[PDB]
Amino acid sequence: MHPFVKALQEHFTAHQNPEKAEPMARYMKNHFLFLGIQTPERRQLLKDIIQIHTLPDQKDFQIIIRELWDLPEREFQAAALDIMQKYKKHINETHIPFLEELIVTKSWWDSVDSIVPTFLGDIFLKHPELISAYIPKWIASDNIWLQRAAILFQLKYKQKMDEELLFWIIGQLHSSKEFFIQKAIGWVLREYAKTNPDVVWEYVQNNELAPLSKREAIKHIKQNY
DNA sequence: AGGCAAGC
DNA sequence: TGCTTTGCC
Ligand SMILES: COc1cc2[nH]c(C(=O)N3C[C@@H](Cn4cnc(N)c5ncnc4-5)c4c3cc(O)c3[nH]c(C(=O)N5CCc6c5c(O)c(OC)c5[nH]c(C(=O)SC)cc65)cc43)cc2cc1O
Ligand SMILES: [Ca+2]
C-alpha cells in the first residue's frame, strides 16, 4: 500500500525475465518465486524509483521493508535490504528486534547473510554490552538462522574480533548437525584466520569441530604448519 | 578488474 | 570434491 512499494513492485514486474526466473528459483531450492532480475539490474531499478520518488522519510522505512518482505518474489526481499542500507545512519540498538524478525521470516542464507555481518555487526560494535542480551538467546533458540547470526555477526570484524566470544559461540554450536551451522563456523574461522591465523590454528587443533567446519577453517593456512 | 565467497 | 554462475569487497 505504500506508494514507494507500489512503484517498486510495478517497475520490477515490468522488467521481469521469465527465462532467468526458473534457474534463479532452483538455486534457492525453490523456496521462493523469482521475477528473474539479477543484482545489477535489481539495484538499478531501485535507483530508478528513488530518482522519481525520492527516498521516503525514515519514519516509513520499517513499513516499506515489511511490505516488501510480504511480496512473493525473492527480489523484493533483496531490494528491501538494499533499501535498509540507505537508512544506515538511522539504524540503532532499538532496531535489533526488527532485524530478528527479518532473520526468522522467509529465512534462507541469502537474506540472513545480508542482514547479519553488516547491520547487526555494526550495531554490536557500538553496543557490545548488549551482545549478552541476544547472542545466548539465539544460540539456545534452535532456530538455525539466529544461530548462524550469532556466528556471523563478527564476520567482517578483522582486528576488532572478540576472540574469546567467537570461540565460546563456536563451542556452543560445534555439535550442530546442521549444514548451515557447520558451514558458518568454517567460514568465520577461515575469515578470521586472515587476521589472526595463529589463534585460529591453536583453536582448531585443540577443540572439537565437525570435519566440514575444520576443513573449511584451515583451507588457506594449513600449508604453514 | 579480479580473487574469494551457495548448487550439485 | 572441485567445478559451476553470480555476488561481495
Ligand atoms: C562478507 O563477505 C562476503 C559475503 C558474500 N556474500 C556472497 C553472496 O551473497 N553470494 C555469492 C554468490 C554464491 N556463490 C557463487 N559462486 C561461488 N563460487 C560461491 N562460493 C560461495 N558462494 C558462492 C551468490 C550470492 C548471493 C546470491 O543471492 C546469489 N544468487 C546466485 C544465483 O542466482 N546464481 C548462482 C548459480 C546460478 C545463479 C543464477 O542466478 C542463474 O540464473 C542464470 C544460474 N543459472 C545457472 C545455470 O544454468 S548453470 C548451467 C546457474 C545459476 C549466486 C549468488 C559472496 C560473499 C563473499 C564474501 O567475502
Ligand atoms: Ca565450498
mmCIF file of N, CA and C in Angstrom, chain A residues 91-195:
data_model
loop_
_atom_site.group_PDB
_atom_site.id
_atom_site.type_symbol
_atom_site.label_atom_id
_atom_site.label_comp_id
_atom_site.label_asym_id
_atom_site.label_seq_id
_atom_site.Cartn_x
_atom_site.Cartn_y
_atom_site.Cartn_z
ATOM 1 N N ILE A 91 19.648 3.490 11.838
ATOM 2 C CA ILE A 91 19.524 2.167 12.455
ATOM 3 C C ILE A 91 20.390 2.089 13.714
ATOM 4 N N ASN A 92 19.780 1.658 14.807
ATOM 5 C CA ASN A 92 20.479 1.594 16.074
ATOM 6 C C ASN A 92 20.008 0.390 16.906
ATOM 7 N N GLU A 93 20.345 0.379 18.188
ATOM 8 C CA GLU A 93 20.087 -0.794 19.013
ATOM 9 C C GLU A 93 18.592 -1.066 19.190
ATOM 10 N N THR A 94 17.764 -0.040 19.014
ATOM 11 C CA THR A 94 16.330 -0.235 19.172
ATOM 12 C C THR A 94 15.760 -1.048 18.017
ATOM 13 N N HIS A 95 16.539 -1.186 16.952
ATOM 14 C CA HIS A 95 16.111 -1.977 15.790
ATOM 15 C C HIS A 95 16.519 -3.426 15.815
ATOM 16 N N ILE A 96 17.210 -3.871 16.860
ATOM 17 C CA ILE A 96 17.618 -5.268 16.859
ATOM 18 C C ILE A 96 16.394 -6.191 16.748
ATOM 19 N N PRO A 97 15.304 -5.930 17.513
ATOM 20 C CA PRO A 97 14.159 -6.841 17.375
ATOM 21 C C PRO A 97 13.563 -6.908 15.971
ATOM 22 N N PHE A 98 13.571 -5.790 15.255
ATOM 23 C CA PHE A 98 13.115 -5.756 13.862
ATOM 24 C C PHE A 98 14.001 -6.637 13.004
ATOM 25 N N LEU A 99 15.309 -6.564 13.221
ATOM 26 C CA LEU A 99 16.220 -7.398 12.470
ATOM 27 C C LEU A 99 16.052 -8.885 12.805
ATOM 28 N N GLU A 100 15.753 -9.198 14.062
ATOM 29 C CA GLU A 100 15.421 -10.574 14.448
ATOM 30 C C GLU A 100 14.246 -11.084 13.642
ATOM 31 N N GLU A 101 13.205 -10.248 13.518
ATOM 32 C CA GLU A 101 12.013 -10.586 12.744
ATOM 33 C C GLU A 101 12.390 -10.924 11.300
ATOM 34 N N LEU A 102 13.234 -10.093 10.697
ATOM 35 C CA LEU A 102 13.617 -10.334 9.313
ATOM 36 C C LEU A 102 14.421 -11.632 9.174
ATOM 37 N N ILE A 103 15.259 -11.942 10.170
ATOM 38 C CA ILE A 103 16.106 -13.122 10.092
ATOM 39 C C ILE A 103 15.248 -14.382 10.070
ATOM 40 N N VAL A 104 14.152 -14.363 10.823
ATOM 41 C CA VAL A 104 13.360 -15.589 11.019
ATOM 42 C C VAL A 104 12.144 -15.674 10.110
ATOM 43 N N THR A 105 11.984 -14.697 9.193
ATOM 44 C CA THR A 105 10.845 -14.650 8.295
ATOM 45 C C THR A 105 11.348 -14.793 6.858
ATOM 46 N N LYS A 106 10.771 -15.736 6.106
ATOM 47 C CA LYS A 106 11.245 -16.062 4.753
ATOM 48 C C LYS A 106 12.762 -16.310 4.813
ATOM 49 N N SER A 107 13.180 -17.092 5.803
ATOM 50 C CA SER A 107 14.589 -17.326 6.042
ATOM 51 C C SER A 107 15.297 -18.167 4.990
ATOM 52 N N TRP A 108 16.473 -17.696 4.577
ATOM 53 C CA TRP A 108 17.415 -18.505 3.816
ATOM 54 C C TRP A 108 18.755 -17.814 3.892
ATOM 55 N N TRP A 109 19.804 -18.418 3.334
ATOM 56 C CA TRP A 109 21.131 -17.883 3.542
ATOM 57 C C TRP A 109 21.329 -16.542 2.846
ATOM 58 N N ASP A 110 20.604 -16.320 1.769
ATOM 59 C CA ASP A 110 20.805 -15.091 1.012
ATOM 60 C C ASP A 110 20.335 -13.891 1.848
ATOM 61 N N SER A 111 19.148 -13.947 2.436
ATOM 62 C CA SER A 111 18.691 -12.828 3.252
ATOM 63 C C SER A 111 19.439 -12.715 4.573
ATOM 64 N N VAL A 112 19.583 -13.837 5.265
ATOM 65 C CA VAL A 112 20.206 -13.815 6.602
ATOM 66 C C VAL A 112 21.647 -13.312 6.513
ATOM 67 N N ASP A 113 22.413 -13.754 5.515
ATOM 68 C CA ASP A 113 23.798 -13.303 5.409
ATOM 69 C C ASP A 113 23.868 -11.809 5.021
ATOM 70 N N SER A 114 22.816 -11.268 4.406
ATOM 71 C CA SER A 114 22.813 -9.862 4.058
ATOM 72 C C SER A 114 22.374 -8.970 5.211
ATOM 73 N N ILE A 115 21.786 -9.557 6.248
ATOM 74 C CA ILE A 115 21.362 -8.815 7.415
ATOM 75 C C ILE A 115 22.452 -8.794 8.474
ATOM 76 N N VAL A 116 23.152 -9.908 8.636
ATOM 77 C CA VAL A 116 23.895 -10.141 9.880
ATOM 78 C C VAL A 116 25.266 -9.417 9.985
ATOM 79 N N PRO A 117 26.212 -9.659 9.062
ATOM 80 C CA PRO A 117 27.547 -9.081 9.313
ATOM 81 C C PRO A 117 27.621 -7.567 9.144
ATOM 82 N N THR A 118 26.702 -6.993 8.378
ATOM 83 C CA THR A 118 26.679 -5.558 8.171
ATOM 84 C C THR A 118 25.815 -4.887 9.242
ATOM 85 N N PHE A 119 24.517 -5.150 9.234
ATOM 86 C CA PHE A 119 23.628 -4.394 10.110
ATOM 87 C C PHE A 119 23.802 -4.767 11.588
ATOM 88 N N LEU A 120 23.764 -6.054 11.914
ATOM 89 C CA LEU A 120 23.969 -6.459 13.291
ATOM 90 C C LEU A 120 25.426 -6.283 13.695
ATOM 91 N N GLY A 121 26.356 -6.568 12.794
ATOM 92 C CA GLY A 121 27.763 -6.329 13.088
ATOM 93 C C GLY A 121 28.017 -4.894 13.534
ATOM 94 N N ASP A 122 27.489 -3.937 12.782
ATOM 95 C CA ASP A 122 27.701 -2.538 13.133
ATOM 96 C C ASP A 122 27.028 -2.156 14.468
ATOM 97 N N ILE A 123 25.806 -2.621 14.685
ATOM 98 C CA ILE A 123 25.107 -2.306 15.929
ATOM 99 C C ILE A 123 25.887 -2.822 17.133
ATOM 100 N N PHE A 124 26.353 -4.065 17.075
ATOM 101 C CA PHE A 124 27.043 -4.625 18.227
ATOM 102 C C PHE A 124 28.478 -4.079 18.377
ATOM 103 N N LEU A 125 29.066 -3.503 17.330
ATOM 104 C CA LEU A 125 30.322 -2.776 17.527
ATOM 105 C C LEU A 125 30.117 -1.540 18.401
ATOM 106 N N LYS A 126 28.966 -0.877 18.241
ATOM 107 C CA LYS A 126 28.693 0.331 19.010
ATOM 108 C C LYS A 126 28.149 -0.029 20.403
ATOM 109 N N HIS A 127 27.472 -1.172 20.485
ATOM 110 C CA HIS A 127 26.809 -1.595 21.721
ATOM 111 C C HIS A 127 27.200 -3.008 22.149
ATOM 112 N N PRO A 128 28.495 -3.235 22.398
ATOM 113 C CA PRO A 128 28.925 -4.598 22.723
ATOM 114 C C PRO A 128 28.405 -5.079 24.084
ATOM 115 N N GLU A 129 27.984 -4.149 24.938
ATOM 116 C CA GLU A 129 27.390 -4.514 26.207
ATOM 117 C C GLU A 129 25.966 -5.087 26.021
ATOM 118 N N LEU A 130 25.421 -5.059 24.790
ATOM 119 C CA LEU A 130 24.106 -5.657 24.525
ATOM 120 C C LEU A 130 24.182 -7.057 23.919
ATOM 121 N N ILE A 131 25.390 -7.519 23.599
ATOM 122 C CA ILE A 131 25.538 -8.838 22.997
ATOM 123 C C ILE A 131 24.947 -9.937 23.878
ATOM 124 N N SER A 132 25.152 -9.846 25.193
ATOM 125 C CA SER A 132 24.714 -10.917 26.078
ATOM 126 C C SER A 132 23.194 -11.015 26.188
ATOM 127 N N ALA A 133 22.474 -9.955 25.809
ATOM 128 C CA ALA A 133 21.007 -9.976 25.775
ATOM 129 C C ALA A 133 20.429 -10.703 24.555
ATOM 130 N N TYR A 134 21.280 -10.967 23.556
ATOM 131 C CA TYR A 134 20.829 -11.543 22.289
ATOM 132 C C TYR A 134 21.528 -12.839 21.894
ATOM 133 N N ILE A 135 22.860 -12.868 21.915
ATOM 134 C CA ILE A 135 23.575 -13.998 21.344
ATOM 135 C C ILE A 135 23.263 -15.309 22.109
ATOM 136 N N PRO A 136 23.277 -15.295 23.459
ATOM 137 C CA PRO A 136 22.936 -16.560 24.148
ATOM 138 C C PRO A 136 21.516 -17.042 23.811
ATOM 139 N N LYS A 137 20.568 -16.106 23.747
ATOM 140 C CA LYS A 137 19.189 -16.407 23.356
ATOM 141 C C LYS A 137 19.128 -17.063 21.990
ATOM 142 N N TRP A 138 19.872 -16.495 21.049
ATOM 143 C CA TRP A 138 19.879 -17.006 19.679
ATOM 144 C C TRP A 138 20.448 -18.414 19.628
ATOM 145 N N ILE A 139 21.537 -18.643 20.355
ATOM 146 C CA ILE A 139 22.166 -19.966 20.370
ATOM 147 C C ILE A 139 21.178 -20.981 20.934
ATOM 148 N N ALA A 140 20.499 -20.616 22.027
ATOM 149 C CA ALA A 140 19.565 -21.526 22.705
ATOM 150 C C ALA A 140 18.252 -21.745 21.948
ATOM 151 N N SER A 141 17.964 -20.902 20.955
ATOM 152 C CA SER A 141 16.657 -20.920 20.286
ATOM 153 C C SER A 141 16.382 -22.138 19.412
ATOM 154 N N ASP A 142 17.440 -22.790 18.968
ATOM 155 C CA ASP A 142 17.341 -23.883 17.997
ATOM 156 C C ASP A 142 16.787 -23.401 16.647
ATOM 157 N N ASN A 143 16.727 -22.089 16.439
ATOM 158 C CA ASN A 143 16.444 -21.555 15.106
ATOM 159 C C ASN A 143 17.774 -21.406 14.388
ATOM 160 N N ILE A 144 17.972 -22.110 13.271
ATOM 161 C CA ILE A 144 19.328 -22.178 12.710
ATOM 162 C C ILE A 144 19.786 -20.822 12.171
ATOM 163 N N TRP A 145 18.840 -19.968 11.820
ATOM 164 C CA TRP A 145 19.204 -18.686 11.218
ATOM 165 C C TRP A 145 19.623 -17.697 12.306
ATOM 166 N N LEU A 146 18.993 -17.735 13.483
ATOM 167 C CA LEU A 146 19.511 -16.955 14.612
ATOM 168 C C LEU A 146 20.860 -17.521 15.112
ATOM 169 N N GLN A 147 21.034 -18.832 15.025
ATOM 170 C CA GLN A 147 22.311 -19.436 15.399
ATOM 171 C C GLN A 147 23.399 -18.992 14.425
ATOM 172 N N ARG A 148 23.087 -19.007 13.132
ATOM 173 C CA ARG A 148 24.046 -18.518 12.151
ATOM 174 C C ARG A 148 24.335 -17.009 12.362
ATOM 175 N N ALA A 149 23.332 -16.246 12.778
ATOM 176 C CA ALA A 149 23.554 -14.848 13.124
ATOM 177 C C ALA A 149 24.544 -14.660 14.270
ATOM 178 N N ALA A 150 24.431 -15.497 15.309
ATOM 179 C CA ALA A 150 25.374 -15.449 16.417
ATOM 180 C C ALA A 150 26.801 -15.708 15.960
ATOM 181 N N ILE A 151 26.968 -16.623 15.020
ATOM 182 C CA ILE A 151 28.290 -16.954 14.470
ATOM 183 C C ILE A 151 28.818 -15.828 13.575
ATOM 184 N N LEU A 152 27.979 -15.297 12.677
ATOM 185 C CA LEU A 152 28.487 -14.432 11.632
ATOM 186 C C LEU A 152 28.403 -12.939 11.907
ATOM 187 N N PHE A 153 27.827 -12.489 13.025
ATOM 188 C CA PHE A 153 27.740 -11.028 13.194
ATOM 189 C C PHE A 153 29.135 -10.403 13.276
ATOM 190 N N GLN A 154 30.163 -11.179 13.666
ATOM 191 C CA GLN A 154 31.531 -10.673 13.748
ATOM 192 C C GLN A 154 32.362 -10.949 12.483
ATOM 193 N N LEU A 155 31.743 -11.513 11.430
ATOM 194 C CA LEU A 155 32.484 -11.965 10.241
ATOM 195 C C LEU A 155 33.438 -10.932 9.651
ATOM 196 N N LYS A 156 33.009 -9.674 9.565
ATOM 197 C CA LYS A 156 33.792 -8.606 8.942
ATOM 198 C C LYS A 156 34.668 -7.829 9.934
ATOM 199 N N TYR A 157 34.769 -8.317 11.171
ATOM 200 C CA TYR A 157 35.405 -7.515 12.197
ATOM 201 C C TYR A 157 36.939 -7.400 12.077
ATOM 202 N N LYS A 158 37.592 -8.403 11.488
ATOM 203 C CA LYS A 158 39.032 -8.414 11.336
ATOM 204 C C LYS A 158 39.689 -8.138 12.712
ATOM 205 N N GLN A 159 40.506 -7.095 12.821
ATOM 206 C CA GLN A 159 41.219 -6.786 14.088
ATOM 207 C C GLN A 159 40.307 -6.441 15.250
ATOM 208 N N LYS A 160 39.024 -6.207 14.989
ATOM 209 C CA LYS A 160 38.056 -5.894 16.038
ATOM 210 C C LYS A 160 37.446 -7.148 16.665
ATOM 211 N N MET A 161 37.745 -8.320 16.102
ATOM 212 C CA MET A 161 37.162 -9.577 16.584
ATOM 213 C C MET A 161 37.354 -9.757 18.087
ATOM 214 N N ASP A 162 36.276 -10.123 18.793
ATOM 215 C CA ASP A 162 36.352 -10.552 20.195
ATOM 216 C C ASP A 162 36.597 -12.045 20.144
ATOM 217 N N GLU A 163 37.876 -12.412 20.235
ATOM 218 C CA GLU A 163 38.308 -13.784 20.079
ATOM 219 C C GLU A 163 37.674 -14.759 21.077
ATOM 220 N N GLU A 164 37.658 -14.410 22.357
ATOM 221 C CA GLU A 164 37.111 -15.306 23.369
ATOM 222 C C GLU A 164 35.615 -15.501 23.148
ATOM 223 N N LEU A 165 34.920 -14.444 22.728
ATOM 224 C CA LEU A 165 33.498 -14.552 22.452
ATOM 225 C C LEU A 165 33.245 -15.450 21.228
ATOM 226 N N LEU A 166 34.019 -15.243 20.160
ATOM 227 C CA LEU A 166 33.868 -16.032 18.942
ATOM 228 C C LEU A 166 34.017 -17.516 19.269
ATOM 229 N N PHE A 167 35.083 -17.846 19.981
ATOM 230 C CA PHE A 167 35.361 -19.252 20.293
ATOM 231 C C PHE A 167 34.302 -19.843 21.221
ATOM 232 N N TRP A 168 33.768 -19.051 22.147
ATOM 233 C CA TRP A 168 32.676 -19.548 23.004
ATOM 234 C C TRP A 168 31.424 -19.884 22.163
ATOM 235 N N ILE A 169 31.042 -18.980 21.266
ATOM 236 C CA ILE A 169 29.904 -19.186 20.387
ATOM 237 C C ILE A 169 30.082 -20.448 19.581
ATOM 238 N N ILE A 170 31.242 -20.583 18.945
ATOM 239 C CA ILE A 170 31.523 -21.749 18.130
ATOM 240 C C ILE A 170 31.462 -23.038 18.964
ATOM 241 N N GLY A 171 32.033 -23.016 20.159
ATOM 242 C CA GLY A 171 31.965 -24.189 21.019
ATOM 243 C C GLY A 171 30.533 -24.589 21.372
ATOM 244 N N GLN A 172 29.650 -23.608 21.500
ATOM 245 C CA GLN A 172 28.269 -23.884 21.854
ATOM 246 C C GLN A 172 27.532 -24.536 20.685
ATOM 247 N N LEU A 173 27.986 -24.269 19.456
ATOM 248 C CA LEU A 173 27.262 -24.723 18.268
ATOM 249 C C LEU A 173 28.009 -25.800 17.456
ATOM 250 N N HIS A 174 29.191 -26.212 17.901
ATOM 251 C CA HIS A 174 30.007 -27.109 17.080
ATOM 252 C C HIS A 174 29.378 -28.480 16.892
ATOM 253 N N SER A 175 28.528 -28.911 17.832
ATOM 254 C CA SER A 175 27.880 -30.211 17.711
ATOM 255 C C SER A 175 26.566 -30.192 16.910
ATOM 256 N N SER A 176 26.248 -29.055 16.294
ATOM 257 C CA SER A 176 25.086 -28.979 15.417
ATOM 258 C C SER A 176 25.266 -29.886 14.210
ATOM 259 N N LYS A 177 24.225 -30.651 13.901
ATOM 260 C CA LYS A 177 24.151 -31.458 12.679
ATOM 261 C C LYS A 177 23.935 -30.619 11.421
ATOM 262 N N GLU A 178 23.564 -29.351 11.603
ATOM 263 C CA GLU A 178 23.008 -28.533 10.523
ATOM 264 C C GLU A 178 24.085 -28.020 9.587
ATOM 265 N N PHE A 179 23.890 -28.252 8.280
ATOM 266 C CA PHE A 179 24.828 -27.757 7.290
ATOM 267 C C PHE A 179 25.112 -26.265 7.490
ATOM 268 N N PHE A 180 24.063 -25.448 7.629
ATOM 269 C CA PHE A 180 24.288 -24.004 7.635
ATOM 270 C C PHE A 180 24.998 -23.502 8.878
ATOM 271 N N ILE A 181 25.029 -24.323 9.936
ATOM 272 C CA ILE A 181 25.782 -24.012 11.155
ATOM 273 C C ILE A 181 27.233 -24.514 10.997
ATOM 274 N N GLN A 182 27.415 -25.770 10.598
ATOM 275 C CA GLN A 182 28.766 -26.277 10.340
ATOM 276 C C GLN A 182 29.507 -25.380 9.351
ATOM 277 N N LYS A 183 28.814 -24.942 8.307
ATOM 278 C CA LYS A 183 29.474 -24.165 7.278
ATOM 279 C C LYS A 183 29.796 -22.750 7.746
ATOM 280 N N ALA A 184 28.890 -22.131 8.486
ATOM 281 C CA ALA A 184 29.135 -20.799 9.042
ATOM 282 C C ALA A 184 30.340 -20.804 9.967
ATOM 283 N N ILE A 185 30.480 -21.859 10.768
ATOM 284 C CA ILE A 185 31.649 -21.992 11.640
ATOM 285 C C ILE A 185 32.955 -22.044 10.815
ATOM 286 N N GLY A 186 32.948 -22.818 9.741
ATOM 287 C CA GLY A 186 34.101 -22.919 8.864
ATOM 288 C C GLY A 186 34.428 -21.561 8.277
ATOM 289 N N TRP A 187 33.395 -20.879 7.800
ATOM 290 C CA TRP A 187 33.552 -19.566 7.166
ATOM 291 C C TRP A 187 34.129 -18.540 8.115
ATOM 292 N N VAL A 188 33.540 -18.376 9.304
ATOM 293 C CA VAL A 188 34.025 -17.319 10.189
ATOM 294 C C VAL A 188 35.459 -17.624 10.667
ATOM 295 N N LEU A 189 35.791 -18.898 10.897
ATOM 296 C CA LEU A 189 37.159 -19.247 11.250
ATOM 297 C C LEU A 189 38.147 -18.989 10.126
ATOM 298 N N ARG A 190 37.795 -19.388 8.901
ATOM 299 C CA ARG A 190 38.642 -19.134 7.731
ATOM 300 C C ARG A 190 38.873 -17.624 7.580
ATOM 301 N N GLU A 191 37.807 -16.854 7.743
ATOM 302 C CA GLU A 191 37.902 -15.420 7.545
ATOM 303 C C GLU A 191 38.748 -14.782 8.644
ATOM 304 N N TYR A 192 38.500 -15.161 9.891
ATOM 305 C CA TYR A 192 39.267 -14.564 10.973
ATOM 306 C C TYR A 192 40.730 -14.995 10.848
ATOM 307 N N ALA A 193 40.996 -16.191 10.319
ATOM 308 C CA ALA A 193 42.395 -16.640 10.144
ATOM 309 C C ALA A 193 43.187 -15.743 9.190
ATOM 310 N N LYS A 194 42.498 -14.944 8.379
ATOM 311 C CA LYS A 194 43.179 -13.975 7.537
ATOM 312 C C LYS A 194 43.791 -12.850 8.367
ATOM 313 N N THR A 195 43.264 -12.673 9.580
ATOM 314 C CA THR A 195 43.711 -11.621 10.500
ATOM 315 C C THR A 195 44.610 -12.183 11.592
#
